[model samples]
Target: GRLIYTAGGYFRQSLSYLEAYNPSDGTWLRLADLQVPRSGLAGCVVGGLLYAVGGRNNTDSSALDCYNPMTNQWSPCAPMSVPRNRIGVGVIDGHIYAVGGSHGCIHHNSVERYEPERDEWHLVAPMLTRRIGVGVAVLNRLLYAVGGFDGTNRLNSAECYYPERNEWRMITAMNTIRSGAGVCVLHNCIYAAGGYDGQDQLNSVERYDVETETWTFVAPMKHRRSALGITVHQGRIYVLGGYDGHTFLDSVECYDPDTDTWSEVTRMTSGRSGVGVAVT
Candidate 1:
């Protein structure tokens, strides 16, 4: 399992650097460069490729590029139909699904899918609400869209999408109204952690169980964060860099289920937010 840190920026500049983490030794190995520089590009893994969804670099971008770790190469695929920045995405079977994003001040509930075999994108039924910086994950083979900002406010609203029906159904909301949280699936359940609510940065964590159809609050993190990244590796969850409402972070924390708690992991060499993570 590994953390995939993709595009980001500092001040007026953006970065295209791609790096991987080793949980065992606490070191980073640089990887192939992104074809275009960006930040807040959502991503996921299917088969041998890493698909980078929509992002921005002074402008909203629709690029959907892939990387081959085996060959150390990058390849282009079909770009998204609607240009999106700060997008959240997930993969079901072999296809990619994306929703809830923005271009500049414009918010979108536009949902779309990509078929790599055909190298084409097709629009899906849109979300029930418009949102940006949403968190998305898959549980029980169905896609779950989590907290994000609607055109007006931070939302605790959550929904599930069934592909066969090609529609979204609202689910239980989180205890906190949030956007830009680190969300992931582990052991058939969903976990959301550390993102900004409309009013302030957060260190809170929550989990969802499809069986129970409920959101369960978990122990909070050590630091307040937004735009942080989280990945499950070796049966545990790793939460990484984001804004603390003051500065970007390099700290890492891991959750252990046996104790229902969080413990500090080795820190990243530099701070990062809006990174892509893939665990093998």
Candidate 2:
């Protein structure tokens, strides 16, 4: 099965797909190129539709585009109210949420929603703090926004957005205060891994339990990195490439919740950071 699909940055400039069979395979069959080459874009699959949200195309863009794998074509959707780059995106109840990114010059707290059925965008309650490089994921219908830079410093603080009430609430901060962390949820828990702390890159991993609203440290990655991408497949979590403060990485790793351990997988074909990943 097609477990995860990701968008490569300008350097790769191709849509890459990862099968669920064995993540470490490092094999990618390129699909159609994005209408515009971009990085730091947000991607998610909703009801069989794959959507790529706001990203930098030299400048911030509010443009929203969707691709149909069956048809092998792309179509334009509604643009976001606020233009941004490196924003966090996730889908819940058939609606897409886009949050926190660098707006032309400054990091923004603005949050917006995209409803594909209606082809519309709606403004939502902004984040409590302005941030960029944040990692986002959905767990039990609640939107979780993880570590990101607050312009002046990298933040370890984590927050959750409750769609039922349309409000943001503070959650336990991560063990390591860093930005560009990769976040993903499985079995009602959120995991954050591999980010930069301004001074250095990090391999530390942390897990947030939604039921407890607290965070606990986990085994660190083998390599220190930031701007990595993460996805959950068949109850296992896969961590992708990112910058290691000194160089880019193509290494990939997977974590088994049952075993509470991580093992190396296939390395990506190219080493790049700020890429986006989604599953079909």
Candidate 3:
């Protein structure tokens, strides 16, 4: 059975909370706590294990931890070279990639990939522009880095990385400038959901056509969100809790590409902003 796992996030402050949502039963089961509290982290499933990457609680952390469902526990992995907060994560060919993130006022364009077998992380080509709270997705073996803050302003520009060439190329920018938006690949397209656009929390959504190399507006989410968690489950895009400017949200929504609409889904047990989500 497939389940969506949501890890550490901010309620009032960084949390060590961990839980898994079973779609079939529509219930959540709490899991073991993280070794350290974290928020703004990135998560992904690789080789049947859930990996929780960089994020911050007090100062900043580069800690990497992997959870085993069988043992129901989390163990530390090799940490990243640079501490990161609001990091973006993706997996390609079984290797996990950590994209741009920031440490306090400093923003990053640096990227790195982890080789599980070697238990090591190697720096890869950095993005053209520094970003934090960026949305990252793997499509057709290419890694896409979406909008995020660049220390000064929220960005609308986007870019993709070609692993073979070790290069990053700019792509068509999103219509709305945003950071902390949820991004995932579904039905052969990449979806960029709600996030802050510098001035406001956004409900606007957009989709990228790989063939056309273009981005177009899609239906807006019912609730505005930023620092949200998103993943594709059972062919539909599920968006979890995030900040909506006024408050941290506990609401959830599901989007069906076939119908081009977003429907309200069962909410999480608690409000979470900067939550880490992954389907396992």
Candidate 4:
């Protein structure tokens, strides 16, 4: 089975933390730290390497770092064109795309794409709306950007990017407003889980169908979470530590699409809000 990896997070408000969870034994093992400590970063696996990009410390960062599991080390790669925190990330056609995020008090509607072969980041068509804490995933060769804060209010808006056309268009919005939700592609659909909706943290979950262009409510998680680490492991959706409004969480949860059920998984070694999760 593949191991789930979670990188830098807001555990201490900022950290270089990294750990790998082995489902076979239900155990987590500490790994190398990031070159730069960060929170609100985004992670995705590309060409068997884990890339952690664009996060915040006291300031936002454009830094991109790649982790090589074989050597258990991290190395710097080309950074994004703009510094961004709370960014959304997705991988498509072996290239990594950085979505909406903010720097300082400025929320961004910008987007950038990375070319691994050239180790460079280039500007791409910006999103229709500025978003922070947006959830992003690639499905059917299209990149979907979901619920996030629009600087004024929590949003239920959703949009997708067409690489072939270099443009974006609105899709059906989500059922409820959510910022910092964990989103992943599972069972040929996109699943978005728990996030803050301005007033409160949430336990709600929803699924989106590209075919019909609709959003449907799914089973809620046991714990309210925002800024969570999420990834698919062994055909199941696994969500890691996140904030519940009151405090950061160390708890974990797993969802099975087949049975439409959620089960508690082992907790992490430390609480981690805005953690970056990927599978390899």
Weakest lDDT window of 10 consecutive positions for candidate 2: 13-22
The whole-model lDDT of each prediction reads: 0.81, 0.80, 0.92, 0.92
TM-score of each: 0.94, 0.92, 0.98, 0.98
Ranking by TM-score: 3, 4, 1, 2
Q: Write the per-residue lDDT of candidate 3 for residues 3-104, one digit (tens) a residue.
A: 999999998889988999998888889999998989999999999999999999758878899999889999999989898899999999999999989877
- Clash count for candidate 2 is 1
**Regions of candidate 1 where Cα sits further than 4 Å from its true position:** 1-12
Candidate 2 regions with alpha-carbon error over 4 angstroms: 10-26
Model 2 per-residue lDDT tens digits across residues 123-226:
89989988898999898888989889888878999888988899999888887887888888877888888888878889988888866877888878888888
Clash counts per candidate, in order, are 1, 1, 0, 0
Deviation of model 2 at 217, angstroms:
1.1
* Number of the candidate with higher TM-score, 2 or 3: 3
C-alpha RMSD of each candidate structure in angstroms: 1.7, 2.4, 0.8, 0.9
Candidate 2 accuracy as TM-score: 0.92
Superposed by TM-score, candidate 2 places the C-alpha of residue 101 at a distance from the truth, in angstroms, of 0.4
lDDT of 4 by residue, 1-280 (tens): 6789999898656988899999789898999988778999999999899999999964999899999999999999998988889999999999999999999888999999999999999999999999999999899999999999889988999999999999999999999999999999998999999988889999999999878888999899999999998999878999999999888899989998889999987999988799898999
